[PDB]
C-alpha cells in the first residue's frame, strides 16, 4: 500500500496473509468470507509468465495478523488448504480478466476479536455502493512504493497498511491504460487534480477492497486487488476484480464443494 497508514488492531479482521512455505515468504493478501473459505486473486496462485503455479501444499494461510513478519503468538491462526479453485475463465494471457480464486481450509477457523469474516454484496448492495466518487478501503502488507532498486527492506511495512480510495468512472479507467478493461474489473484512486494520493501495490493482490454500508453498518467486499501499472502514478488507477459480477461462480463453488 502506497500512501496509506498503519491499520488499527482489529480494523480488518477478515484480512488474510497468503504465505509460501519454502522459501518462507509473503505471497499475497486474501480475505476470509466464512469459517472455511478464503477469497484471493487467481494470479497469486497461477501466473505462468512468472513461473507461478502453486498447489494446496505449497501454501499456508495466516489469519488474524497485524505484524508483517512476527508470528503473533496466541493471536494469529494458521490453516492449511484443502482445495484451490481458480475461475475457469481466468485470463492470465492478456489482462487478468476474472482474477479470482477460492481456497477451502482443511478445518474451520474459530473467530475472535482479530478474526472475523467480511460480507459479500447482494445485487442491491452492489448497485447502491459501486458508484463513482464513493470511497472504499484497501489493505495489505505489500510494497510502500513502486520499487526501482529490484529488491529492498525499506519497501516493506512492519504492520498491515490501510488506505481509502474513491471509485472512478469507467471512461477515466478506460483512458488511463491500453490494457483491455472488462466488466469484471473496476478501478479506484484519486485523479491528479484531486491532490490526495494512494494506491495498492505489488504484494497487495488478493486483498480486499471493502465498503461500509450506511444502511446496516456492515462491511462488504466489493473488490480484490488485481493489477496496475506502477503504483500511485499520476493518471493511473488501481484495478480490482469486480466481486459482485463473479458472485454466481463464487456461490456455485461454495454450494457444490461445500461444508
Amino acid at each position: 500500500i502506497v500512501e496509506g497508514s498503519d491499520a488499527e488492531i482489529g480494523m480488518s479482521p477478515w484480512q488474510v496473509m497468503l504465505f509460501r512455505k519454502s522459501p518462507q515468504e509473503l505471497l499475497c493478501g486474501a480475505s476470509l468470507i466464512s469459517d472455511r473459505w478464503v477469497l484471493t486473486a487467481a494470479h497469486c496462485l497461477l501466473y505462468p509468465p512468472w513461473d507461478k503455479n502453486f498447489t494446496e501444499n505449497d501454501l499456508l494461510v495466516r489469519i488474524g495478523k497485524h505484524s508483517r513478519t512476527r508470528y503473533e503468538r496466541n493471536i494469529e491462526k494458521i490453516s492449511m488448504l484443502e482445495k484451490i479453485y481458480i475461475h475457469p475463465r481466468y485470463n492470465w494471457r492478456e489482462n487478468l480478466d476474472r482474477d479470482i480464486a477460492l481456497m477451502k481450509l482443511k478445518k474451520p477457523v474459530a473467530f475472535s476479536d482479530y478474526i472475523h469474516p467480511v460480507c459479500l454484496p447482494d445485487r442491491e448492495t452492489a448497485a447502491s455502493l459501486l458508484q463513482a466518487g464513493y470511497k472504499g478501503r484497501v489493505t495489505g502488507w505489500g510494497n510502500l512504493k513502486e520499487t526501482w532498486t529490484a529488491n529492498v527492506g525499506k519497501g516493506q511495512p512492519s504492520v498491515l497498511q490501510v488506505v481509502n480510495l474513491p471509485i472512478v468512472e469507467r471512461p477515466v479507467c478506460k483512458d488511463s491504460t491500453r490494457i483491455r478493461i472488462t466488466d469484471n474489473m473496476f478501478c479506484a484512486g484519486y485523479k491528479p487534480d484531486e491532490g490526495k494520493r494512494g494506491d495498492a501495490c505489488e504484494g497487495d493482490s488478493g486483498g480486499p477492497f471493502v465498503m461500509k454500508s450506511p444502511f446496516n453498518n456492515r462491511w462488504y467486499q466489493m473488490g480484490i486487488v488485481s493489477w496496475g501499472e506502477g503504483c500511485d502514478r499520476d493518471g493511473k488507477y488501481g484495478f480490482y476484480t469486480h466481486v459482485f459480477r463473479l458472485k454466481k461462480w463464487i456461490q456455485k463453488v461454495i454450494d457444490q464443494f461445500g461444508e
Binding site: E8, S112, P117, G133, R137, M211, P214
Partner: peptide, 30 residues
C-alpha cells in the same frame, strides 16, 4: 451472533469507530 458478517468485534460491536471510516461515509453525501 450468528450471521454477523462484516461487523467487527473491536469496532461496530463496541460502538467504536475506526480513525478513517468517517471519510467513507462522507463520500456517499458529497
Amino acid at each position: 451472533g450468528e450471521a454477523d458478517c462484516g461487523l467487527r468485534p473491536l469496532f461496530e460491536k463496541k460502538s467504536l469507530e475506526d480513525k478513517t471510516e468517517r471519510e467513507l461515509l462522507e463520500s456517499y453525501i458529497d
